[PDB]
């Protein structure tokens, strides 16, 4: 049959070209992903996918603790960091296999789905909530046997779909040995806009250390790059107050990952508008873990203040979150989640997987590795589409008990 | 051949469009329903935005005895799609205006291929110039009988849009509004508004003011201005209050936004002047057509004669968030009405159809898929266009013209 | 041609048995509608139809009102009074087309058909309505009120029973006001009503008792209903009576059907006050369309001073059982038509045709020949054909009437 | 391939339109089903499952307990509840997976397919279950916990009606508990009782009063139901005053729901003494299935004193009416999968898929379209040809499921 049929229904035969009109001269290639996960004390835990994901980053492992809530382990990758050798690329095909090959010295399920938004835009990420993240039955799975094991497919989320520079690093020299300059992933970015205050009041009793507040708090995603712009207007009748504002991306296990100071001693002069601007840039390697909401934290302080003294002033203002090609299908949604539970602590979870690209190299490989625009077949889009369109009479699905996507792949060949 | 069926007879329903942008979806069918009033000239505008991505499909204005244009209303969908969904795309569009009601009067319709600033003539007359394609263009037909506005594609393998739909998000303010906007294929303006400007002029109690500059830009949801001034000066004591205004069609002011507030300037060094404001949608009231800058210049302890002056330089870049994703800003279809009874309603009704990506809550409960394989109807799009002349398909229509193709159509 | 199809797609061709297995021996009947309905100061207004209702109700005509309520006007229905002369009943086809036929261009028509009943529909002006259903061969939107708008049934299942049509029975009776009835009764509908689940009460004594409403909920009637249930109440305090009212509220905030429940009901103390419910209204009582129940409940101590705390915990479910109200098109599915900016003092005119299969009653059985009714091998099949394409095809439920004609032609050519 | 008898005989795949009489404008949905249920100490229980349930109940779990008792663990429902999205109903195909997933080779299951309600069984022990019907096709026995059965839902009848589901209707009370909905009503079941027919009760005074269950009966009800009726009592001695309760018993023998008839009503004597019954019990305190009902009647003597004869006579029907019983699926048949010898601690897992045509309530109407659904001019034929020839097919409601997945094989080709 036709090869790009063969690659997007069995990634792990290798790469093909997709039969589109974005005519690029390129080259193919399969990047493999291999992880061996240890399973936490509550036995729980979940591996969020990112199957369109234009690049290196395959995932997040994240672990359930006893109070409820799930804590980082870590990130997924491919086995190589394509940023590295490539400066442009396009996800051909993917597949992931979960399952555990494991026992500790002298068990578990798995329940998956594929939710057509971003992380934080799941409403339930319990193992049991999740069977309802979408209305699709061939985009949930539920209760395989760990053992057994789960495959994860990636299936189209449009096609001619632009390359993706990879942020790859640039030529650049600098004092700091610690300097970092990439060229980032940004055609088509993703933009939120939050209006944290209109005429908002604020009013309290002084205090040493000053009066802190949380203005507001939003669900972002964000994975590379992202810019924070935009500004507040301070309004105040009294005299001697200074601001001190901090922003904060917070992570999907609730902790800290990125703090930025917006204000610092921002003194307010009355009867003027007092404006505190941002401009912030946060680069992908500051970003250690999926991001999943932000917050901004205002302090208001008097410095020559007393017990009783009053602290206020009024607020107006907007904030506009640019993530870099957050956008770009793939790039943020949509996301596969798989669930397990009930595995003995200690135990493994091994996830492998391959992902095939159409890539450009960087300048450097270049003049080792030959680019070409790729097979041309005539037939293969309108089998594509027509498959697609067939999906679910044929049974296609982006998670399988690898069982069955097994039975699938004869039934093919 | 759904696709085509949908295209030309959108009131018909939905269907996929046959390109290769493969997503998941669903396909929705949005009315539109208006009766507006006509003014005490019997003149007015409708302002169509027949490839909006959402459920904008247009503001109504009315003429003054003065000449000038009144804000109205927008014309919307019957429900607001970012409510329930997250994603979305064209299909398809048609509207009729006709009068329903007496308490007379003809119709000028045009599709112009820019914005709304970008029209150099907006009188009933004037417009039948906006364009030089005959199909694009209809003219004095009878308001009883109607128009008909058929929206025609401005590119396929257009990307899904974001639809401005709100994000959880908890604040102090109770006025507090989060949302991710429409973003992809931004439109940028970039204008240079000092380059080593010399500003001087005699003191006056109160400071004096002046317009630096005034340009046409095109907004209906949220945009950004970013950059900044520099301004130097030999003079002591001086302060500068600077300005933003964003107008709208019929001149009014839509927005302002102070970027500096008694900014004094030091001697000898560069005084920066920063721009960091982002508009959100749901401040932005009618359709923005230009944008200008105030700047007033005032010496406290300043006594007549003392001599007030600085030189400048600067460039600002207005992004119109996804502004440039074909269907958003451009093109227009200006559908203009004269000599209509006062009093009289000028009906609106249409319908718009989608595909569309569920926000998650509503994902929950509804299926999307890939859409049918229909082989064909890709070439079969691009031959009617083509053939778009000698086929007479436009994108005005005397209604009664519109119907009579309607049947030639469903006979063929 | 098919006359199934015939009758289904332009019944007022007249009636047809339908194809399906509900071998009965009947007769087909035709019953027009016509009305001239005026129009008020508003200019606005809103005509509810009951497209399936297997009987001689067609709906409900009722004007805006400058303060933005709804008022009754007055029921549709047909010709004659279908229950006189039957006992049961099937609807086999209906169309009705809405237009202004007089002036004292003139306004727009708004239409839709909801998949639900009356009192289930979350917005009921004439805008809102364009988003009562996703299907958009289930609206209209701003026809011409002289052009017109045309209703047309389309099924809500097939395999229907035949319906009682509540028919009066041979009864005899002291009270000259006695009435007797064999009702639509079939499938009933039934809500259930937790009023309360050891809900707190304690209020301040006023003259006449101190009134509340326990609840108040969103129901459907058109037709004889029952009510059933009981609450029960506890009490600390010493003297206490209860007076209980249950309301049938209609469409337009008005009372329908009120029914004491409860009239100095004395509440002994540390004990459970039973409180039952054993209410049947009865068709001939229900005025207009039914959308709300609440209960009202006036406690009083026996003393009579004004402030005095008065206090009881109550717990109770009711059961209010439509009779037939689940039956397909007894109360869902419901075609509604508004116009606006229409003259005052004009004439919006109804005309319309139901088609049925009906067994006669006892003495007209003595003259009306029942039979089971052609034999007709592939209309089943042509009708699921076309409503399954109905999309492709452009079959409405509610039209503009000039399309509607059009499409009458464009069928009689092919047939 | 008929995409009906697909999805009738693999739910899985997905759902279809029933291609029978019931044209209704409607749309199709899969919910799926995921349980990890954990064993208890004597190593049984059962599972009892309501194959054609129209609506989310799936079943209820039980662990037999050391005393031979069960006791009641959990209801088994669909991943969201229904009545909160859609208003009517009707099942179009199911089907269920129970097995063991985990090890603290233990255990046997025994399943059968009762063609009556709950409380019409027999016998509920492991083994006496493989008698409860004649039906080689609809019992399975003694298939390894490991290996697992399935549970395919076969029809009983089709152009039924669409049912309510129960759903919420509009309602404001003083209240914040008042529930109110619109519940699944057609085709009620009505259970007449006769209690007493000149019924003589006689008994010596006691502080206290004299507690007798007039009777005790089986009946059967997952959702809303309604007691009507009376009782009339007559006597001779002066001073007898009546409390009376009626007890609604789950499976388990535990009381599910308590109501007063009667309390503290006084006898006149010589007159034709009327004790009423206006019962009505909602869904939501309905919290197992009931499977009994009995009435208690306690009879006093205000100012008796020890020695004091105490007698009454009575007469009476009640009329026990379960809205939409007899609905077929609502209560029968019933699908019963027990299990044996399984360590405890170990977890059955259940996993399955319902099909539905539904219609959405009114807020979802406004963003979800429905449809006639697809003509199929043979498939209703080939149902019947299919169902008639079940014996020959082998096509079981119960099977282990190793041969339930070589039957998908042999279709598939
Ligand atoms: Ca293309
Ligand atoms: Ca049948």
Same mark, same amino acid.
């Given at each position: 049959?036709?090869?790009?049929?063969?690659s997007?229904?069995?990634?792990?035969?290798?790469?093909?070209?997709?039969?589109?009109?974005?005519?690029?001269?390129? @080259?193919?290639?399969?990047? @493999?992903?291999?992880?061996?996960?240890?399973?936490?004390?509550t036995?729980?835990?979940?591996?969020?996918?990112?199957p369109?994901?234009?690049?290196?980053?395959?995932?997040? +492992?994240? $672990?359930?603790?006893?109070?409820g809530?799930?804590?980082?382990?870590?990130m997924?990758?491919?086995?190589?960091?394509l940023?590295?050798?490539?400066?442009?690329?396009?996800?051909?095909?993917?597949?992931?296999?979960?399952?555990?090959?494991?026992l500790? #010295?002298?068990?578990?399920?798995?329940?998956?789905?594929?939710?057509?938004?971003?992380?934080?835009?799941?409403?339930?990420?319990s193992?049991?909530?999740?069977?309802?993240?979408?209305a699709?039955?061939?985009?949930?799975?539920?209760?395989?046997?760990?053992?057994?094991?789960?495959?994860?497919?990636?299936?189209p $989320?449009?096609?001619?779909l632009?390359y993706?520079?990879?942020?790859?690093?640039?030529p650049?020299? #600098?004092?700091?040995?610690?300097?970092?300059?990439?060229?980032?992933?940004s055609?088509?970015?993703?933009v939120?806009?939050?209006?944290?205050?209109?005429?908002y009041?604020?009013?309290?009793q002084?205090?040493?250390?000053?009066? $802190? /507040?949380?203005?507001?708090?939003?669900? /972002?995603?964000?994975?590379?790059?992202?810019?924070?712009?935009?500004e507040?207007?301070?309004? @105040?009748?009294?005299?001697?107050?200074?601001?001190?504002?901090?922003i904060?991306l917070?992570?999907f296990?609730?902790?800290?990952?990125?703090?930025?100071?917006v204000?610092s001693?921002?003194?307010?002069?009355?009867?003027?508008?007092?404006?505190?601007?941002?401009?912030?840039?946060?680069?992908?390697?500051?970003?250690?873990?999926?991001?999943?909401?932000?917050?901004?934290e205002?302090?208001?302080?008097?410095?020559?203040?007393?017990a009783?003294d009053?602290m206020?002033?009024?607020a107006?203002?907007?904030?506009?979150?640019?993530? +870099?090609?957050?956008?770009?299908?793939?790039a943020?949604?949509?996301? @596969?989640?798989?669930?397990?539970?009930?595995?003995?602590?200690?135990?493994?979870?091994?996830?492998?997987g391959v992902?095939?690209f159409?890539? /450009?190299?960087?300048?450097?490989?270049?003049?080792?590795?030959?680019?070409?625009?790729?097979?041309?077949?005539?037939?293969?889009?309108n089998?594509?589409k027509?498959?697609?369109?067939?999906?679910?009479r044929?049974?296609?699905?982006?998670?399988w008990?690898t069982?069955?996507?097994?039975?699938?792949?004869?039934?093919?060949?």
């Amino acid at each position: 049959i036709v090869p790009f049929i063969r690659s997007l229904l069995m990634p792990t035969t290798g790469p093909a070209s997709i039969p589109d009109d974005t005519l690029e001269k390129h @080259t193919l290639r399969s990047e @493999t992903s291999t992880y061996n996960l240890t399973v936490g004390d509550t036995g729980s835990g979940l591996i969020v996918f990112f199957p369109g994901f234009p690049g290196s980053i395959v995932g997040a +492992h994240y $672990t359930l603790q006893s109070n409820g809530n799930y804590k980082f382990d870590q990130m997924l990758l491919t086995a190589q960091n394509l940023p590295a050798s490539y400066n442009y690329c396009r996800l051909v095909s993917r597949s992931l296999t979960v399952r555990s090959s494991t026992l500790p #010295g002298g068990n578990g399920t798995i329940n998956a789905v594929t939710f057509q938004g971003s992380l934080s835009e799941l409403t339930d990420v319990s193992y049991n909530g999740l069977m309802s993240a979408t209305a699709n039955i061939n985009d949930k799975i539920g209760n395989v046997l760990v053992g057994e094991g789960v495959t994860v497919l990636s299936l189209p $989320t449009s096609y001619d779909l632009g390359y993706v520079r990879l942020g790859d690093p640039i030529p650049a020299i #600098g004092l700091d040995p610690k300097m970092v300059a990439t060229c980032d992933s940004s055609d088509r970015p993703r933009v939120y806009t939050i209006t944290a205050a209109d005429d908002y009041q604020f009013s309290s009793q002084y205090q040493s250390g000053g009066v $802190t /507040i949380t203005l507001f708090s939003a669900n /972002i995603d964000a994975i590379t790059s992202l810019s924070i712009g935009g500004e507040l207007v301070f309004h @105040t009748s009294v005299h001697g107050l200074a601001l001190d504002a901090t922003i904060y991306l917070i992570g999907f296990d609730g902790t800290t990952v990125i703090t930025r100071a917006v204000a610092s001693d921002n003194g307010l002069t009355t009867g003027i508008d007092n404006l505190m601007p941002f401009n912030l840039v946060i680069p992908t390697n500051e970003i250690t873990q999926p991001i999943t909401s932000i917050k901004l934290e205002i302090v208001t302080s008097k410095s020559g203040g007393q017990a009783g003294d009053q602290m206020s002033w009024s607020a107006s203002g907007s904030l506009a979150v640019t993530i +870099h090609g957050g956008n770009y299908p793939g790039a943020l949604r949509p996301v @596969t989640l798989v669930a397990y539970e009930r595995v003995a602590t200690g135990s493994v979870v091994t996830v492998a997987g391959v992902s095939n690209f159409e890539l /450009i190299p960087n300048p450097e490989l270049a003049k080792n590795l030959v680019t070409e625009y790729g097979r041309f077949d005539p037939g293969a889009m309108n089998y594509t589409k027509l498959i697609l369109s067939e999906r679910e009479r044929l049974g296609i699905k982006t998670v399988w008990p690898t069982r069955e996507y097994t039975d699938f792949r004869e039934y093919f060949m």
